Motif scaffolding. Structure first.
Motif, PDB file in Angstrom:
ATOM      1  N   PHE A  43      -3.156  13.111   3.783  1.00 37.55           N
ATOM      2  CA  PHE A  43      -1.846  12.468   3.578  1.00 37.55           C
ATOM      3  C   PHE A  43      -0.734  13.525   3.468  1.00 37.55           C
ATOM      4  CE2 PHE A  43      -2.662   7.974   2.776  1.00 37.55           C
ATOM      5  CZ  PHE A  43      -3.998   7.943   2.418  1.00 37.55           C
ATOM      6  N   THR A  44      -0.449  14.245   4.552  1.00 42.51           N
ATOM      7  CA  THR A  44       0.523  15.341   4.502  1.00 42.51           C
ATOM      8  C   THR A  44       1.870  14.947   3.883  1.00 42.51           C
ATOM      9  OG1 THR A  44      -0.434  16.114   6.596  1.00 42.51           O
ATOM     10  CG2 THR A  44       1.594  17.198   5.842  1.00 42.51           C
ATOM     11  N   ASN A  45       2.432  13.845   4.365  1.00 46.75           N
ATOM     12  CA  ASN A  45       3.743  13.391   3.904  1.00 46.75           C
ATOM     13  C   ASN A  45       3.749  12.984   2.436  1.00 46.75           C
ATOM     14  OD1 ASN A  45       2.215  11.050   4.297  1.00 46.75           O
ATOM     15  ND2 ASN A  45       3.912   9.890   5.229  1.00 46.75           N
ATOM     16  N   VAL A  46       2.749  12.206   2.027  1.00 50.51           N
ATOM     17  CA  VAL A  46       2.644  11.791   0.633  1.00 50.51           C
ATOM     18  C   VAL A  46       2.523  13.012  -0.286  1.00 50.51           C
ATOM     19  CG1 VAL A  46       1.182  10.720  -1.109  1.00 50.51           C
ATOM     20  CG2 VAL A  46       1.716   9.491   1.023  1.00 50.51           C
ATOM     21  N   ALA A  98       6.831   8.277  -2.007  1.00 50.03           N
ATOM     22  CA  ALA A  98       5.397   8.511  -2.022  1.00 50.03           C
ATOM     23  C   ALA A  98       4.664   7.187  -2.155  1.00 50.03           C
ATOM     24  CB  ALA A  98       5.024   9.446  -3.141  1.00 50.03           C
ATOM     25  N   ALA A  99       5.125   6.330  -3.059  1.00 46.81           N
ATOM     26  CA  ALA A  99       4.453   5.053  -3.282  1.00 46.81           C
ATOM     27  C   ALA A  99       4.564   4.158  -2.054  1.00 46.81           C
ATOM     28  CB  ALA A  99       5.024   4.348  -4.511  1.00 46.81           C
ATOM     29  N   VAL A 100       5.741   4.138  -1.445  1.00 43.66           N
ATOM     30  CA  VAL A 100       5.915   3.334  -0.224  1.00 43.66           C
ATOM     31  C   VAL A 100       4.976   3.805   0.873  1.00 43.66           C
ATOM     32  CG1 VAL A 100       7.429   2.992   1.761  1.00 43.66           C
ATOM     33  CG2 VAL A 100       8.245   2.451  -0.560  1.00 43.66           C
ATOM     34  N   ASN A 101       4.827   5.115   1.013  1.00 49.21           N
ATOM     35  CA  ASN A 101       3.931   5.625   2.055  1.00 49.21           C
ATOM     36  C   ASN A 101       2.458   5.408   1.758  1.00 49.21           C
ATOM     37  OD1 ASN A 101       5.271   7.132   4.522  1.00 49.21           O
ATOM     38  ND2 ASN A 101       6.636   7.249   2.745  1.00 49.21           N
ATOM     39  N   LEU A 102       2.081   5.472   0.484  1.00 43.25           N
ATOM     40  CA  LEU A 102       0.700   5.148   0.123  1.00 43.25           C
ATOM     41  C   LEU A 102       0.364   3.689   0.449  1.00 43.25           C
ATOM     42  CD1 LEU A 102       0.291   6.996  -3.281  1.00 43.25           C
ATOM     43  CD2 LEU A 102      -1.115   7.378  -1.194  1.00 43.25           C
ATOM     44  N   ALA A 103       1.371   2.832   0.339  1.00 46.34           N
ATOM     45  CA  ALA A 103       1.193   1.412   0.615  1.00 46.34           C
ATOM     46  C   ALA A 103       1.053   1.116   2.112  1.00 46.34           C
ATOM     47  CB  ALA A 103       2.341   0.603   0.006  1.00 46.34           C
ATOM     48  N   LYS A 104       1.262   2.120   2.965  1.00 44.16           N
ATOM     49  CA  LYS A 104       0.972   1.990   4.402  1.00 44.16           C
ATOM     50  C   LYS A 104      -0.481   2.315   4.754  1.00 44.16           C
ATOM     51  CE  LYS A 104       5.681   3.448   5.567  1.00 44.16           C
ATOM     52  NZ  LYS A 104       6.511   4.532   6.183  1.00 44.16           N
ATOM     53  N   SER A 105      -1.192   2.951   3.829  1.00 41.67           N
ATOM     54  CA  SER A 105      -2.516   3.496   4.148  1.00 41.67           C
ATOM     55  C   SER A 105      -3.581   2.433   4.339  1.00 41.67           C
ATOM     56  CB  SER A 105      -2.999   4.471   3.058  1.00 41.67           C
ATOM     57  OG  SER A 105      -3.311   3.779   1.866  1.00 41.67           O
ATOM     58  N   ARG A 106      -4.623   2.771   5.097  1.00 38.90           N
ATOM     59  CA  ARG A 106      -5.749   1.854   5.242  1.00 38.90           C
ATOM     60  C   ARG A 106      -6.475   1.723   3.910  1.00 38.90           C
ATOM     61  N   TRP A 107      -6.531   2.820   3.151  1.00 34.15           N
ATOM     62  CA  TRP A 107      -7.167   2.799   1.844  1.00 34.15           C
ATOM     63  C   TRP A 107      -6.649   1.646   0.997  1.00 34.15           C
ATOM     64  CZ3 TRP A 107      -4.177   4.836  -2.589  1.00 34.15           C
ATOM     65  CH2 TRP A 107      -4.859   4.691  -3.813  1.00 34.15           C
ATOM     66  N   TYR A 108      -5.333   1.583   0.850  1.00 32.32           N
ATOM     67  CA  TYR A 108      -4.696   0.523   0.078  1.00 32.32           C
ATOM     68  C   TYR A 108      -4.843  -0.832   0.794  1.00 32.32           C
ATOM     69  CZ  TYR A 108      -1.275  -2.837  -1.295  1.00 32.32           C
ATOM     70  OH  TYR A 108      -0.699  -4.031  -1.641  1.00 32.32           O
ATOM     71  N   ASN A 109      -4.437  -0.869   2.062  1.00 35.25           N
ATOM     72  CA  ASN A 109      -4.379  -2.153   2.776  1.00 35.25           C
ATOM     73  C   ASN A 109      -5.711  -2.871   2.996  1.00 35.25           C
ATOM     74  OD1 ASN A 109      -1.469  -2.884   3.356  1.00 35.25           O
ATOM     75  ND2 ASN A 109      -1.546  -0.697   3.921  1.00 35.25           N
ATOM     76  N   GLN A 110      -6.794  -2.125   3.179  1.00 33.51           N
ATOM     77  CA  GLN A 110      -8.102  -2.757   3.349  1.00 33.51           C
ATOM     78  C   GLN A 110      -8.640  -3.320   2.031  1.00 33.51           C
ATOM     79  OE1 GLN A 110      -7.926  -3.016   6.998  1.00 33.51           O
ATOM     80  NE2 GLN A 110     -10.077  -3.275   6.407  1.00 33.51           N
ATOM     81  N   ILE A 152      -1.272   3.307  -7.031  1.00 32.79           N
ATOM     82  CA  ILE A 152       0.007   3.509  -6.353  1.00 32.79           C
ATOM     83  C   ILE A 152       1.157   3.330  -7.337  1.00 32.79           C
ATOM     84  CG2 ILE A 152       1.545   2.577  -4.563  1.00 32.79           C
ATOM     85  CD1 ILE A 152      -0.935   2.019  -2.862  1.00 32.79           C
ATOM     86  N   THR A 153       1.116   2.247  -8.092  1.00 32.31           N
ATOM     87  CA  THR A 153       2.102   2.044  -9.152  1.00 32.31           C
ATOM     88  C   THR A 153       2.184   3.238 -10.098  1.00 32.31           C
ATOM     89  OG1 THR A 153       1.864  -0.363  -9.037  1.00 32.31           O
ATOM     90  CG2 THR A 153       2.843   0.562 -11.064  1.00 32.31           C
ATOM     91  N   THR A 154       1.029   3.819 -10.415  1.00 32.63           N
ATOM     92  CA  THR A 154       1.000   4.951 -11.347  1.00 32.63           C
ATOM     93  C   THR A 154       1.649   6.180 -10.728  1.00 32.63           C
ATOM     94  OG1 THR A 154      -0.971   4.063 -12.373  1.00 32.63           O
ATOM     95  CG2 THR A 154      -0.448   6.362 -12.846  1.00 32.63           C
TER      96      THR A 154
END
Length: 175
Positions: free
Chosen positions: A125-128, A140-152, A161-163
């Motif tokens: 996650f270079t950008n995060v 950072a939180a918005v970009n984590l919410a794009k990830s497959r990790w979160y979305n799946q 992510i909230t933390t």
């Protein structure tokens, strides 16, 4: 916050955090990605063969488990896994400087993320990682919410992510 609410942060730590996100199961079960899991988020194998997962389990625990462990065993394995995640961060030239820049609560979120995804997944996650080091928490939180990790598997990742966004324990309150 009442006296009680000010106490809540001293009750929270990486173990209590992952315990909430991962749950505690004493029998082999499939996680949201369909991977055989036991205890507190212990991934046994990605093989769809239950026999491989039982074999990994007996290796991990050191006895003939037949798919079931004790709470004390779940906790020992969990402590080993947490230590492994922390060690994976600190030895990594990419993750360590970002981790070091973080406050204590965001460090827990970091360890949690690595526990869930593994070191190479997180280090990718270079950008995060840049955003975290620059204290750009919302981005950072918005970009984590794009990830497959979160979305799946949103329920397992949402509180992490909230933390990262807030650096407080609020997402772990009122379960």
């Amino acid at each position: 916050p009442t006296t009680e609410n000010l106490y809540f942060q001293g009750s929270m730590n990486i173990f209590e955090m992952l315990r909430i996100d991962e749950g505690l199961r004493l029998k082999i079960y499939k996680d949201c990605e369909g991977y055989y899991t036991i205890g507190i988020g212990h991934l046994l194998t990605k093989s769809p063969d239950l026999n491989a997962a039982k074999s990994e389990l007996d290796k991990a625990i050191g006895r003939n488990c037949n798919g079931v462990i004790t709470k004390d065993e779940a906790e020992k394995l969990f402590n080993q896994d947490v230590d492994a995640a922390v060690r994976g961060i600190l030895r990594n030239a990419k993750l360590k400087p970002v981790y070091d820049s973080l406050d204590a609560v965001r460090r827990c979120a970091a360890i949690n993320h690595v526990f869930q995804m593994g070191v190479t997944g997180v280090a990718g996650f270079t950008n995060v990682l840049r955003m975290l080091q620059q204290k750009r928490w919302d981005e950072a939180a918005v970009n984590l919410a794009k990830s497959r990790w979160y979305n799946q598997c949103p329920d397992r990742a949402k509180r992490v992510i909230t933390t990262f966004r807030t650096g407080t324990w609020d997402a772990y309150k009122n379960l």
